[model samples]
Target chain A: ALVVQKYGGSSLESAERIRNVAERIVATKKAGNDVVVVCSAMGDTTDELLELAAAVNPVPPAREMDMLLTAGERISNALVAMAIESLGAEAQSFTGSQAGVLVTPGRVREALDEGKICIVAGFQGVLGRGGSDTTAVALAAALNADVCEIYSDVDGVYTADPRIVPNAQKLEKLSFEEMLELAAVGSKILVLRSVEYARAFNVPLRVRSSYSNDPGTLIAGSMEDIPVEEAVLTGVATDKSEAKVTVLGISDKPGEAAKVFRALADAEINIDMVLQNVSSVEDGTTDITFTCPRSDGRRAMEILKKLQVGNWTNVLYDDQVGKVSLVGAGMKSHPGVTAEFMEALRDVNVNIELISTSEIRISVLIREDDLDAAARALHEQFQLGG
Target chain B: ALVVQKYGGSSLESAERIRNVAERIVATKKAGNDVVVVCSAMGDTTDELLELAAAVNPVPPAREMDMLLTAGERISNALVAMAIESLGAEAQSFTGSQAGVVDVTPGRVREALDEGKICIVAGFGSDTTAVALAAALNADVCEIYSDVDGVYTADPRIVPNAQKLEKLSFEEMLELAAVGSKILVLRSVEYARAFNVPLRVRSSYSNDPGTLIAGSMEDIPVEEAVLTGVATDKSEAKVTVLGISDKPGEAAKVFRALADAEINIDMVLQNVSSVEDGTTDITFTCPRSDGRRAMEILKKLQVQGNWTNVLYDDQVGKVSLVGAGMKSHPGVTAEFMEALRDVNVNIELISTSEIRISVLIREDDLDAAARALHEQFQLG
Candidate 1:
């Protein structure tokens, strides 16, 4: 069997942990598998590198930042390789052009076949945003590995955050769509782009903990391939990092709203959830509300004020908001799923300020303070606990 | 005109310092000479990297170390390029190989300079890369920028009366470095000598004409002092192998073991054979860092008569008097040893070349010995 493994930065934070990972890699190789490992920078290395760049220049060039940040992963990769060799196994570390995509892994394959483990430092050498996750999945696709394992602090996907719902159960398997919806709604176990890449290439991904031997969750194939019991409800995800903004008394003209969002897009701010209401039908003015990342709230407001699109009264900002979502492929086939979801939140007295739904998921923006209770209620309603 | 300048790690340690260096480089270029700049890693970067490698593996493989170590230089090089460009000058940064000097024929470097851009190349922990590049580009002069002003008669920190040398022959600088001078390393001086690259050792902090090191011994003025400078090294330890059979292969066996362990043996002395026992003792000095290893290897070689016992002493230092005049002048060695004797220092071992005389002595006596020789030879 051929395995592609990606170790998170936290797992490679210290030399002891690196040695442990090296031993695990060697053990896997000795278990009769060719292993290709992808490593991330040690804990907080990227942030520290960014700090150095900021110290040098407040606004450094993008190309130089990429060069500076890539050094972190290269450092970790080489260290792990050295660690593996110290454990009496051979390993090679590699770096490639932007996103490790410029060159094929001819040398990588050769080293693996030569009885050496391959550790590719995962990052786009140039500017790109998906980070090491995309790099690992892409490599997995390229090599056609039997399984791509993602090692992180948490062991696997759960019906709800175990911290919030004490009895939340861990799911052994999830379809690609379920994983995508959970990741998109804020599972934080895997990046959405990586899950999408794995699905497109049909690469099986295993999300597990580097610290434990737990098998964790396996995500692959379409919904039909997942067992019926596993499809009822994958998880309840909570996102408390969003802020809501309301543009008051704006024009009803179609392009008027376009102008407001264009300013945000130009600033590179992502608008997550939006709602519109006609405050006065006779006056031809409306109020538009949207949710964006809390960190971008201040800048987003500033851009809207500077643009002054339409005849808006005053802008309102609320940072005390959270989005609780119910994501599962089985929900599309389950009748009255949204009714049951709304009833659960209502019993918890959680106010739903905005509602958005797709075929397999339902998300509602509520007060940040009630986010945990809302998730717990929904988790209990779906009977997703052990 | 073309100039090759090398800045030490300390000069490029921080953003402000890098900007200062960039301004110095830009100013040099604005003066009408094309410039190729070589930069070391930021201050303590190499040490930290080595520490990381050591933490991971007790004996890290050398190839991976090279990969990990080169990262420091690349970072410094790119930062310097950014700093230079921030100052409104078009500056380009390149890795050692990317600069296409693998390690010579510097075509890319020439192209960068031809475009009126200040080209910065990252280097390892020595000035060897700078000197090699200088030789390849045929620059007018190679400027070595460091914290100190220039080569001194003696380390001023130790000998307060020491004076900085304004000029030195390549042979003199090489001998000084070989003995203990830290201003310029031995290898860089040798390269500069081989290629006849006019080298300047100067400070990056100030605009001083630090020291000019070039040419051969004949290039020195006729009226110069009998000694160029007195140098002292406290980094060596003495080792003595006792009671070895008085035979040809016995000494070779001891040295062969040390060689295999990669210990650098500096000085050697063989005692007169004990006629009754037909045995002799061999003593030598090597780097103190390797003294323990050297002792271990010698101990491993002990099964009986090859060497009955091994002694290791780290409290030793070497002081050397170097000058071309020493070769042609009479009584210089006598004067040198006499000065040390006057300082109440006992010489343990002595090694000499035509133009240099080096003597190992008690580590504590090194400063006084260097000062005595400096005054005796009138180098100040």
Candidate 2:
């Protein structure tokens, strides 16, 4: 069997940790498998590199910053490769540029054929989301590896954060749709794009921990392929990292909202959820509100103010909101799932500020203080406790 | 005009230092000269990398080590290039591997130069690489900037009143380099001599004309200083084999054994055979690093008879006087010996060439010998 594994920075924080990971990788290779490992930089390496770059140049060139940042992963990969070699395995480390030729997969397969374990530095020369997990999953899809295992601090995705809800159960398996919805709503385990990539290529992904022996959750299969016995409610996710922006008194006209959004888009601010209130008939003006990343709140407001296209009486920005979401593929077939979800939140006295839903997911903006209570209430209403 | 400058590790120890060097490079470019900069790793970066590698692997693979070690230079060059860009002059940085393609021709470099941008290349011992690039690019001059300002009459640190030499012929520089001038590596001097590339050794901290080493002093316009400078080396140890059979092949067998061990023999002296036992003692100096190996090899050699003792002394220094004019000045050697004798600095061994004379002395007297020799030739 051929296996692709990705290790995060925490797993390779120090020499001992790197050595331990190397042993595991060597063991996997020795256990009748050809292994390709993608590794992140050591803990805090990227941060340290950024600090160094910042000290040198206040506004360093992006090309050179990338060059400087990639050095951390290169160092970790080389150290891991040497550690693997010390453990009686033939290992080779490669940077993203070197193995990018393996975007052709020629060098990678050749190494696997030659019985060499390949350790590739992740996040090097890659300029997109999903980071190391994306690298692993992409390599797996390209090589047709049997499985792509993602190793991080946590073992697997739970009904909710195990720390937040002690009764939360670790799902044995979930469809890629369920994983994607969970990740998009702040599961914070596997990145959303990695799951999307896996689904696109129909690749199997196993989420596990680098620090222990956990069978982990396997994410694969199509929506219909999952067993009918699977729960209609997979998990409850909560996010507090978004801010709300409200634009008041815009004349009800074609493209009025479009103008505001287009300016935000031009500024590269991603708006998460949007809402508009009915207009006043006498004034012909409507109020629009939207949520975006909290970090981009100031800039997004700045961008909208700079537009000068909208005749808005006032604009308000608030970062004091949290979002709670319920996601599951089974919900599509189970009718009235949204009612029960909202009723549970209502039972907890959690005020819903806005709402958005997909066929398999329902999300709502609520007071930041009510987030945990709302999730617990939903988990109880859906009988999701372990 | 095209100029190639190489900055050593000390000159680039901090961000401020790197920025300073970048300004100098940009100034050179703005002064209507095309510039290529070669830089070594930053201060102690190589050693820090080694320490990291050591902590990870007991014995790391050399291939991986090269990759790890080159990261230092890559960091420095990139920082420098970015600094140059910040200073408003466009710059580009290349790794040793990236620029290795220039072995055949510097097509990329030439294109960069044509674009009016300064080029920075990172490598270990960047001096040789700079000299090599200067030769290939047919640069007007290659300037090597380090901690010290330039080549001096003697190491200014050791000889307090030693003066800097503004001009030196390549041959004289070669002799100084060979005898233990740390200002320039012997390999770079040899390469520059072969390519006839004008070389300048200067400090990065200051704006000075520095020492210019060329094919001729006439080309550089120098003072009427017959002797170039005095150089001292404490890195060599003296090894003496006592009471060895006085035979024609005896010394050959001893040196052949040392050579087989890859020990470089610098100076050799053999005493006349005694009338009684037909035995003699031979003394030679080699790098202190090779002293132990040389002793081991001599101990195991199959000589004619038993040798009394194999003595090894690492506390020995060699002081050499170098000058092109020594060929015409026969009295220079006597003056050199007399100066040493006057200082009561015992000469353990002596050797000479057409334009050079080197003497082995106690390591403690090395400074006194260099000071005396420098004053004797009026080089200061």
Candidate 3:
């Protein structure tokens, strides 16, 4: 079997750690497997390189940054190659492009169309149309790897953050849909676009920790292969780093509503979970509220304020909020999952401000202070602990 | 047009110097051309890495050493890349193999070929096969360029050599190269032979101190390219610390001959020079009589009637006269040259090995004869 293993920067923090990783790879090769290892720069190397870039140019063009950042992978790859050879194994390193990761041009969202079994440097790809994600896609396609073992500092994806929900159990397996939802919602197990690429390419991903030798959650194809007796709640995931904004007393008309949203959208703002109330009879006005990334709050508000033509009474933005989601494929079939979820939240005195649901997931917004209690309560109520 | 240039360790010895090199590369790129750069490990980096390797294993395996040694290039390449990027230029560094320099699997020799633009890691090639492989790939090969003018008739380090050479035919270079000459290594030259790669060895330290090494002598105007200067090697050490053990064998007899006379030899001429005096007199030499301590060991044996007197002498200088004309002029004899010589510089020993004539002169007058002969031949 061919395995493509990727080691993040934290895993290869030092020369000693690199040698250890090399030994593990040699052992895998000795076990009669063709091993292709991908590696990030050593600890803090990428950050240092990025800092250097910033020093040179406050806003360095992405194309040049990509070229600059790729050196991290090159260093790690060469070091690992040396270490592997020190252990009497034949190992070679190839850059993302040399590994055949052909990308589209420019620094936008690019894809890796092809490549071979290569030790590609991550976080970098040859500039093509769009930016370089070619390294990620190319590794999967070219190696025909049976498994892509992403070795990060974390073990696996949690339904809810284990820090808050002490009983948050590690999922043995997750469907692509569940993983994608968690990733998009900021689970931080894998880059969202990378997970999307895995789903698109049908690549089986095993997200594990580099420090431990354990089988992490296997993000596989569909939920059909899972035993029907097993409960569907994979894990709870949350993102407290979001802000809510309300545009009060907006003119209830087509162009007015369009203009308000168009301003924010034109500024490359991402709005999550938008809510609008029906127009009131006295003033022919309505209220619109939406959540966006907290970091982008200031810029989003600036753009909204700049929409002088679209008259609005007031704009309210709040950062003290958190969103928690319960995800499971079985939730679609389990009728009482919502009632049970709401009951758990109520039991913990955690009020839900806004609610959203999809076929396999349910998300609720709550005060930031109650997020921990709410997550733990829901985790215990659902008996998610193993 | 795109050009690939390679810089050696000396050219980039300090952080300040590296920054300067980075600026030069950026300037080249700014001149509307694509540029690739190959660089050797920083000054003494290879040696430092070797020292580390020695600490791990007294003698590391060759393959492992190659693996370890390549890391030096990684450091240089990455640092250079970072420096170049800091200057607002797009630059990337590739290992030798990453740049498509495929050598034979076992050792450092190039056996095949391919071509591309990449700043390949320079300096150490695996072996003969790896070298041939690099050449077959049609690599734009340049060598250890520094601020010194260029390839000269002699090593500038020892000879106070000329500033530069207009051009040199490959044959001339091969003839001037001696066992200890600090010019290009023979392996690189042979690789150049297989691939027919033209070498432009110029000083990165200066703009015009450059020499173009080409295939045929006809390509260069002979008048424009004459003898650079004469080079000498003072590093040779001769060891004759052992005296005869009063045995009958050739080894014992040889040692006995050197024990009789206190003549110190630079390089030992043993077997034939040994005398069979029943108790053999060992005949040995030393570059300097520093090996006299070894003679003490033999003296103790002499007290036991095993050998004779200990011999020691340090009055020798190995002077080599290098010139391309020697390749075609066989009539350049030691006798014809002796008649034109100054008696002030006594010739103690004579050795003619190849395209050069080597004579051991009196240590005191070696410089005067070198300068005088150099002037007589208009070598400078």
Candidate 4:
């Protein structure tokens, strides 16, 4: 298998860890698996580069800053290639320029075909999100490789975060929809675009750890083969990004919701799970509730605060809210799903401020303090514990 | 006027210093000179890189070591260019490869004349790259910058009163370089002379005018002064091969072995052959760095082909006085000899050229010999 492995900085934080990675690459190659490793700068290197730019110029210039920053990956690739040869092992370096070509990872399949473990640089157009992960995605899209294995310190994705729930189970495999939801909903195991890249290009992803030998979780569309009963509910995911906003005394009239949404949209804040009290006790006015990324919450409220709108409301916003979501495409058509899951959060006296539902997911805005309980309770209720 | 400015590492040791150079270059540019600035690595950067290479491997391959070291120059070049740009001056950088500099080697003087912009690189020992660059560009002048004023009668540090010549012929500069003035070197002078480019030496810290070393031997301005000054070298290991066969290939055989070991032999002195015996002693000096390998090679030769025992001494030094006009003067050697003899400084071996007189002396006696020669020649 020509496995394209992408590991981030945390996996490559130290010399001992780099040595371990080298040994593992050697072992993987010796065992008939052709391995191509994609790496992030070791441990906050990109961030450190940002800090360096910040030190030099507060608002770093992206074009020049990218050049200054990619030094991290250049440094890593050389140190790794040199570390291998630093063992006093045999090697010859090349630079594509006039003289000897510097070590740039060309086609890795050729390296593997020649029985060499390829340690490629994670350089591309960085400074955008998913810097090197996007590189691996593009390479996966580019190559005829077998799999894009995303490796790090963690072995694989869990039912709930292992850090938060010790007994959280590692799924044998995951569906695209589930992975995407988890990715966006605080499970940073993989970015949605990277998963989307794999899905688009038909590249398989095996999330594994570099420290050991394991096949890890296969994120493929084996939807037909999965035991439908068990695959119904894969996991529970949580996010602290969303903030709850309450617009007091909104006019219960036409285009009123559009007027409020138009302000947030203009500010480019993506609101999730909106709710409003109809013309019940308030008669003609309504209090609108919605959740948005907390990072954008300040600006989102500022935009609404500046609004002279027909929504007829006072701006009320709270950033200390979390998104506790239960995601499973299978549980969508199953009856009593809401009552079954809602009872779990209710058991812990977890207050749900707003509710939103999709065919494959259920999400609610809760006080940030109860997010952990909501997730654990959902995990236990959903029987996702391994 | 198109000026080729070169700054050394000491002048660029810190960012603040780099800023100063950038400011100076802008002012220089503003003054209407098309400034093509050359530079050395920041103070101790190249040396520290060598230390890093040493730490990584006792014998780091020269190729990789050069790559590692050139990073120092490349990095500094980018930084200075950035510094200039940060100050809102338009600037760009070219690497050793891009600028036609010697591969793996740093330091040089002007060329790339038509670049019409500030080209920063190593100066003094002009990288074959720079000389090749300037020669190709038909560049106007190579202005060298250093700590001291210029080519002095002697080291300004050792003899504060040393004369800083206003100008020198390439030959006189070459002679001084051969004898030992840190400000000028053989290849740079030879390159300048070979390419017909004029070279200038200046103080990086001083605003005062500097010395010009231009033109050929026949073109040099003749002057009354005959004695330039004395130069001293202590970093040599002396070898004496006693009673070697006075055959034609014998010297070649000995030299070939040392050459194979890459040891540079300097200051050779051989005894006048005995007409009756066809045997004499051959002695020479080489760098102390090549001492062990040189000794090892000659010891094997002594065991195999040499006529007698080999004596290896690391406790020797050389002092030489250079002057372009010595060929027209008489008793210059006598006056030099008398000065050393008066100090009771023993001259172990003596060698001379029309323009240079060098003597091997005890490492401990070098200071006295230099001081005596400096005073007698009125070099300070």
Candidate 5:
């Protein structure tokens, strides 16, 4: 069977590690398998390159930045190719596009259809319009790879953050529903777009660590042969990089919300987890809070403040809040899941300010300091730390 | 018009220097010319890679070594591409084969027929192969580059070499080239034969130091474009790593192993058969005394299959007294031989190609022999 292995920068951080990676690749080839290996640049090389770009242009044009960033992978691919060849293997390294990776012209969401087996440079894609969400999914689709192995620094997907819940178990396999829930809830294991593409294309993803030979978690369709049991929360994923902006006393009008958001969107700012208070019976005003990237908070607020003519009373932005999400496919069928989730958080003295739910997941906003405690309580309450 | 610029490593040893090269290339393009750039690896990167190969497997397989060595060009290509891109120009890098650099399987003097606007790689092909390939591919211009000024009438590095030849006809180049004048390598010259490619030799250091080498000897205004320069190579080492063993297949086995490793052996000599306990000591010379490696391979066979002890000596150099006119002049060799004899330069081994006579000597005596031969041949 053909296997596609991808190595991140940390795995190939040094020259010695690069050779070791090459040896492993050769060993795989010698084991009667056609292996396609994707690689990232050496350790810190990409970061250094990004830093260099920042120095050259404080706000480099996105297109030129993409071009400049792509060179990192080219260097890695050539070096690894040479290392593989040094081992008596005919190894060819192709760039993302050369490997038959085609995306829509300007974005990363719509992958073009193509078929070939190739080693593509990862974390980069041709800057074009309306392309696939991530280059990995697009490349996997183009190559028709039987299995996509996402090699990273972590061993595998866990039921929860292992550092917070020491007993968190590594899942050997996860259903697509559970994987999507985990991904959408902020688990940083796999690129969200990659998972979406994999689910759409029915491509099996094997998330493994480059430093270990352990069997990794396999994400595929649900298996009916396995009987359904009490739904357990897989993990509590958190994001602290977002700031909540609350716009108070907005004029209760037809286009007030639209006008407020359209201005932010025009500034290329992304708003996540928006909440609007019910329209007040006594006062003709409602409060709305939305989360956006922390780095863009100042600019987003500036854009909102310019809408003072729209009669929004006050704007408050908070960056100290954290989000904890419980992800599981069986959450919809199990009503006790939510009650037990809140009970666990209450037991840990954590107060949830906002709650959101999907068919397969639930997320709550809490204090940044309470995230680990809340996650651990929920993990144990749901008996997920197997 | 299409212009191909081949830059040596020294020309772009630093990032700042590379920016300069990029500026030059951009200027050329801005001058309404299509440009293809060929570049060597960065400073000492190739040598460092060779050292790495040696450390890994003393006798790295040739095909594998080629694959490894080619990375040098890849690194160079990527850097140059990035440099050019930074200048707001589009550039692409291709390997030798990707660039359609076809060469004979084992010999260097083969030409590539397919050519477009490309910066063809250098330092690997024969002079004839390079020129022929450039011509056949319809390369409008070909540049032979190095770190020093263009071809001098004598070795500037050695003898305050004669004035650099401003320009010379192809015939004069071939003639002056025959007399150990360092201009273009002979292999590239032979390629020039098959397809009359115009050649120019220039130093990457200064654009002013350049010589145009092409057809029409009479076009040159020089009174006599005799010998242009002299070069001495002290790196060649003779190896007697494999001694004769009594067994019939022992010699064949030793040579076959070296051949399999792609180690080219030169000027081999085995002493006359002598009956000493029914075995004999045999000795042969290889151009490079990477003898320890050859010995390591041979010793394994020797230990397992019982062969005689191995001997290795690297204190040897090959001094090739070359001149194109030697083939027609029968007295050239005789005079060369007598001059060397007068200088008391003992020849340990002698080999000859069509236009060159190479003799092995004590490594320490090579410089003296080269200087004496230069003066005797009126090359000074």
Candidate 6:
């Protein structure tokens, strides 16, 4: 099977390290399969390039900065190619507009089909986090390879925050749904946008560490690939970034709530979980509640205040609440999973303000003190510890 | 009249200096004439770049080094262009290739230039932009603004109140540079001569008219031109191979060894030969900086060929006086040797041209000798 590997900048920091990466790539090629490697600017190259830009202009021009910062990746790409040649292996490095987006998908696909390994510069090419990740998985889906391997700073996915839960198991395998649920929460081993694209094509993904040669977790196949006897718990996470907004004495009229909500969409604020009050037949005044990212909280409020909605009284905001979530793919298939999850949080005696649910995950807004205990209780209940 | 002005790296060492250069360029453009300017990298930028290349690889590929060094000029060119634009005028910067000539910068300067806005081009190091653009643009006169002002009779800093010559011929400037006058490079003078671009050398800090070295005055009208200038170089070493074989290929072999070692020999003196023996003495001068390497090579050749000995002496200097018709009047050369002889200055070696005479003297007496020749020849 053809495997496309992407190495992080730290993995190719110096000539010696670049040589190490080159040797690994040549070894992959020698294993009787095609390989195309992607690398980023070595070490702190982007940082240094930023320093140069800041020195030249307080707010450097965007287009020139893009071109100038691309220089670092180009340097490392050529250096790695030269290093590969020094090892008696033929290799070629390419620039971004040449190898990244412009010609290389065709050029590299052409080279791979011709039985060659091409070193390509990555992060500086597409210019974003997981820029190379998107490129690799896209290549995988295109080639329809047996498996696509991504090398990064992390070794594998974990059941919990590995630092907090030292005994957390490194999952040898992952289902797409559970991975999505876990990914929605911590240690984003894979970026969401790229993973969504990969999943759309159902391309196989193998996560590996660029620094070590250990076998890594495989995020592969369907969620049903697991047996019935397996644990129904995935992972638990807490988000303090959510802001809860409640409007009291809102007009009990249709689309009046929408006029307030439309003002929000006009402001480009996202509505996470929204609720409306039951009919207040006594006066024609109702209430509305919603939660959104705290960063957009202030702007959403400003836009809400300007809307001349009928008889909306005052607003209440709770930004200190943490949203704790429990994720598992098999939760939908199993009975009492939600009830047991509720019991685990109830066992902590934490104040639960709201509850939200999806097929594979259950989430709640609770007082800040219960976030960690809620997560640990769910982890213990699910039997996800190492 | 359209004028082409060239500024050196020292004139543009920092942001403040580049602004000053832009002001000068703007002023030149404002004076009812179109202006195009040439500039080098800021002072020590080239040195800093070379240091970076050395750090990357003990031996960086020459091809990459050239490209990397060009970045220095690229940076300065854009900065200067922006500086001009900052001062309420328009400006554009172009690379040598974009402008049209071969190496670093060029000239579409005349046609593409908007009536008054200046075109800034990268100069020096790899590209002789100023010289190339002057002739290419067909400018009436080329003004060179550098740290030093014009071509002087001697280096003004050393020779106090040294006279500055207003006009010089191409040949005289070429000879002066070769004899270490250190004002302008020979290639620029050759271009000025070949392309018919007259040069006016001026200081970047001043408003003086400076000196004009013209191609039309090729010989400086020998009557008005008595002696062009006096030059001194302490960077010379005298090498004498005692008892070398008095044979044809043997003398060729001696030069071949020096050539293989890449030692550039400046002046040669070989006249001593004995009829009774097949041995002769050959003495030559080369850069004192290359003395040790040249010494090792010649000593090896001496031992291999059974010559008597090899000697190295770097405690010497060469003082030369150039004139348009110094040779046509034999008395000029006679008076030069006579003056040195009067100073108790014993001549170690001598070389002459139709219009120039170089004498080897002790390093300590270089200045005294140059001053004496300058006064005796009435160059002041």
Fraction of native contacts (fnat) of each candidate: 0.50, 0.33, 0.01, 0.00, 0.00, 0.00
- What are the per-candidate TM-scores when only chain A is compared? 0.91, 0.90, 0.86, 0.81, 0.85, 0.80
**lDDT agreement of model 4 with the native:** 0.69
Q: Write the per-residue lDDT of candidate 6 for residues B1-380, one digit (tens) a residue.
A: 78988877788776667778878888877787778777676687678656644543555554445444554665566566666766666775555667756642343655557555677776323325677777877778888888777788886666775798988777777787887756777678788888888888889888888888886444455566567888999888999988887877877888898999899987778886988786889888888888889989889888885578989999988899987767556688889889898888888878876677888889899988887787787777
lDDT string for model 1 (A163-255, tens) is 888989988988889888888867777788888989998899999998999999999788866666666777899999889888888878768
The list of candidate 5 runs beyond 4 A from truth reads A1-153, A209-213, A222-230, A243-321, A333-343, A351-357, B8-20, B39-133, B144-186, B201-223, B238-286, B291-313, B317-380
What DockQ does each candidate score versus the true complex, computed on alpha carbons?
Answer: 0.51, 0.37, 0.07, 0.12, 0.06, 0.13
Model 4, range A200-303, lDDT digits (tens) per residue?
A: 76677878888778668888764444565665777888888778777787767788788889888877888766877566554577778888877888887887
TM-score of 5: 0.66
lDDT per residue as tens, model 1, B210-322:
99998888766655645788888998899998889887787788889999999999768775899998988888988889999999899888755466889889999999988
TM-scores, one per candidate: 0.89, 0.84, 0.58, 0.72, 0.66, 0.67
Cα lDDT tens digits for candidate 3, B229-316: 5655554433443445444464644445445655344344434334554333334445354455555655665567544455555555
DockQ computed for model 1 against the true two-chain complex using alpha carbons: 0.51
Please give, for every candidate in the order listed, the TM-score of chain B alone compared with the true chain B: 0.91, 0.87, 0.67, 0.86, 0.64, 0.90
Ordered list by lDDT, greatest first? 1, 2, 6, 4, 5, 3
Residue-by-residue lDDT tens digits, candidate 5, A296-327: 89898888887865578888878888888888
- Per model, how many backbone clashes are there? 2, 1, 45, 17, 37, 2
Interface RMSD of each: 1.7, 1.7, 5.4, 4.2, 5.6, 5.0
Model 6 lDDT tens row, A1-386: 58877776777666667767778877887887777666666787667656644543455444444444444555555555655555555665444435545323666667677666776653333454345566667666766667777776778877777655556777787777778777774445677776776677787777878678888888787676677777457677667667888777887767777777888887888887787757778887877888888988888777766653435777777777777787877787889888888888788787678877778888888876677777787788777896
Q: What is the lDDT, from 0 to 100, of the residue B127 in candidate 6?
A: 25
lDDT of 4 by residue, B43-161 (tens): 88677655544544455555545555554554456556655566555554554555554333223223333444566653224334455555655667777767766777776666656
Candidates sorted on TM-score, descending? 1, 2, 4, 6, 5, 3
The predicted structure with the larger TM-score, 1 or 5, is: 1
Q: Which ten residues in a row have the lowest lDDT in candidate 4 chain B?
A: B104-113
